[PDB]
Amino acid sequence: MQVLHVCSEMFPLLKTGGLADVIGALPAAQIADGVDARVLLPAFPDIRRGVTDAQVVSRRDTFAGHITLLFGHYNGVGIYLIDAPHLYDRPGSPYHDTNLFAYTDNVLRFALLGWVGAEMASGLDPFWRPDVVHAHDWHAGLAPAYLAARGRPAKSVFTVHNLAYQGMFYAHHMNDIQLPWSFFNIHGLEFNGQISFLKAGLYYADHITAVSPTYAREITEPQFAYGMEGLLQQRHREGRLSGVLNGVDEKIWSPETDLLLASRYTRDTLEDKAENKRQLQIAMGLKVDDKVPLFAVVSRLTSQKGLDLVLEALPGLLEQGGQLALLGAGDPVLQEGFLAAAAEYPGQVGVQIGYHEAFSHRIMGGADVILVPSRFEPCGLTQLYGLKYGTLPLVRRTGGLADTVSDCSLENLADGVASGFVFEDSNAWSLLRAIRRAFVLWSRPSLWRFVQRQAMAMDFSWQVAAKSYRELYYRLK
Numbered sequence: 117m118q119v120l121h122v123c124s125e126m127f128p129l130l131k132t133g134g135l136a137d138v139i140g141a142l143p144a145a146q147i148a149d150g151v152d153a154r155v156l157l158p159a160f161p162d163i164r165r166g167v168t169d170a171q172v173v174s175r176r177d178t179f180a181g182h183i184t185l186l187f188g189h190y191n192g193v194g195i196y197l198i199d200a201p202h203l204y205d206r207p208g209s210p211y212h213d214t215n216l217f218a219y220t221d222n223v224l225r226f227a228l229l230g231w232v233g234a235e236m237a238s239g240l241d242p243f244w245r246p247d248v249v250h251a252h253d254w255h256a257g258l259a260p261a262y263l264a265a266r267g268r269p270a271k272s273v274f275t276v277h278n279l280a281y282q283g284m285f286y287a288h289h290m291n292d293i294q295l296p297w298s299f300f301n302i303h304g305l306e307f308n309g310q311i312s313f314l315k316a317g318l319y320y321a322d323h324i325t326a327v328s329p330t331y332a333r334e335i336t337e338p339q340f341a342y343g344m345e346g347l348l349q350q351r352h353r354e355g356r357l358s359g360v361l362n363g364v365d366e367k368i369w370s371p372e373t374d375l376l377l378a379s380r381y382t383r384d385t386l387e388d389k390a391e392n393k394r395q396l397q398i399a400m401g402l403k404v405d406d407k408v409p410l411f412a413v414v415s416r417l418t419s420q421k422g423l424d425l426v427l428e429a430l431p432g433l434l435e436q437g438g439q440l441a442l443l444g445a446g447d448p449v450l451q452e453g454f455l456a457a458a459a460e461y462p463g464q465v466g467v468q469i470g471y472h473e474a475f476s477h478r479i480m481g482g483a484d485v486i487l488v489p490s491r492f493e494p495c496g497l498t499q500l501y502g503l504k505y506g507t508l509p510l511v512r513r514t515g516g517l518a519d520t521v522s523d524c525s526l527e528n529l530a531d532g533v534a535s536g537f538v539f540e541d542s543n544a545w546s547l548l549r550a551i552r553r554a555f556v557l558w559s560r561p562s563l564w565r566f567v568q569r570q571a572m573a574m575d576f577s578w579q580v581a582a583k584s585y586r587e588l589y590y591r592l593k
């Protein structure tokens with residue numbers, strides 16, 4: 117069974133969110149579980165420089181100009197790179213320019229990604245051909261469309277990591293992407309009078325996967341599907357929609373071996389976590405104090421994440437004696453809101469705006485609680501990292517958060533299953549009740565430790581997840 121993943125990022129070469137973590141870890145797990153998995157990425161500069169053994173496979177002309185298909189390895193997995201400097205050799209984000217505006221040729225940049233994924237099924241590489249093309253998110257959404265147009269020389273799965281990003285382009289671009297004009301149809305890639313790469317992925321794939329069992333249910337609802345729900349309801353009925361939960365990469369997110377930490381620690385030696393908290397407090401300019409709970413955020417700052425609710429709730433949190441440490445980047449309103457809070461409450465609120473990979477580990481390893489009050493959350497990895505690090509997640513019951521965190525209710529505590537704090541509604545009052553629950557648990561240190569050890573006993577394994585994907589691939593044939 118040979119599978120090609122088609123996507124736009126991969127940890128540690130290029131990362132803007134959880135997708136990169138998935139692509140950095142899933143393929144190696146699949147290989148251990150008996151599927152020959154390879155990855156296809158655009159040759160963005162950070163990616164191209166990471167793959168040092170890359171060699172030329174072939175040159176092709178394309179609706180978007182010439183490519184050199186390269187192939188090399190990273191961490192033992194086979195990586196194909198689409199080297200097309202006129203599209204991909206640009207500094208910064210792969211998705212937008214430095215003024216945060218989408219590149220005007222994005223339609224071509226990402227249409228090409230899907231085209232190469234499909235061409236691989238037809239022998240673009242004379243020595244290797246995938247049985248299944250596994251496309252991820254809108255960026256790779258045309259891969260199943262190009263496959264369909266060619267008579268489906270391989271099977272395809274499309275996985276949604278986030279349905280809010282639709283890959284919308286003006287209809288006239290049908291002229292530019294070398295797909296049959298008949299594809300521009302509601303029974304096709306058309307959506308609200310435009311081309312949607314997301315729609316294309318959802319429509320043309322043999323099978324759709326979402327990144328948690330409950331998100332897969334949620335996206336059949338208007339509230340989470342933003343117009344796509346009719347298609348997804350139909351595919352559900354056809355047995356062509358399922359959920360497979362992400363794992364966590366233990367090479368990188370384990371307090372037991374984490375080299376980025378002041379002090380490594382384990383489920384049975386949580387006293388060794390204390391030094392990380394002390395150093396985190398110092399680093400953030402917070403009062404150094406082990407008697408007080410330190411809440412944390414490591415997050416993109418967009419409305420998805422419900423961090424406006426944290427701002428609303430902050431005074432109540434501080435009033436009860438807590439501290440906040442936030443690391444994040446995104447909406448300037450949020451950035452300034454949090455910067456203003458750090459200014460207003462020095463020694464109680466520490467804030468760092470920007471993307472800092474190493475610092476996220478130091479937060480995860482030192483904080484007592486990780487706040488993930490999401491409006492929607494296809495899976496969420498930060499809460500999984502919190503569980504593994506014994507930093508209790510406080511989450512809204514939605515998407516993967518609902519699948520992975522067990523509230524500290526009476527039953528869950530009595531059954532030995534409690535692992536964090538859960539609230540229901542997207543408002544600050546509902547958040548504040550879960551925050552109070554945390555303060556109550558904090559006042560009972562031995563119960564807190566009991567819950568920490570349960571959180572750290574939870575397992576989210578890529579090789580287990582790989583087993584589910586493998587069943588899917590063989591079923592498709």
Ligand SMILES: Nc1ncnc2c1ncn2[C@@H]1O[C@H](COP(=O)(O)OP(=O)(O)O)[C@@H](O)[C@H]1O
Nearest residue numbers: 133134415416444470471472473476496497498
């Ligand atoms: N500002 C940041 N600095 C460092 N890492 C970040 C930052 N923001 C998010 N991350 C990391 O990016 C990943 C986010 O993944 P996830 O929780 O699935 O949410 P999303 O993909 O929606 O951003 C995690 O590895 C998280 O630690």
Ligand SMILES: O=S(=O)(O)C[C@H](O)CN1CCN(CCO)CC1
Nearest residue numbers: 132133134135136211218281283
């Ligand atoms: O905003 S764009 O649609 O132009 C580009 C991407 O969709 C933005 N993202 C969302 C988060 N991603 C990785 C997080 O898992 C994919 C890049």
Ligand SMILES: OC[C@H]1O[C@H](O)[C@H](O)[C@@H](O)[C@@H]1O
Nearest residue numbers: 134135277327494495496497
């Ligand atoms: O699948 C990896 C990640 O993809 C998306 O970015 C989602 O927002 C996040 O919930 C998920 O964990």
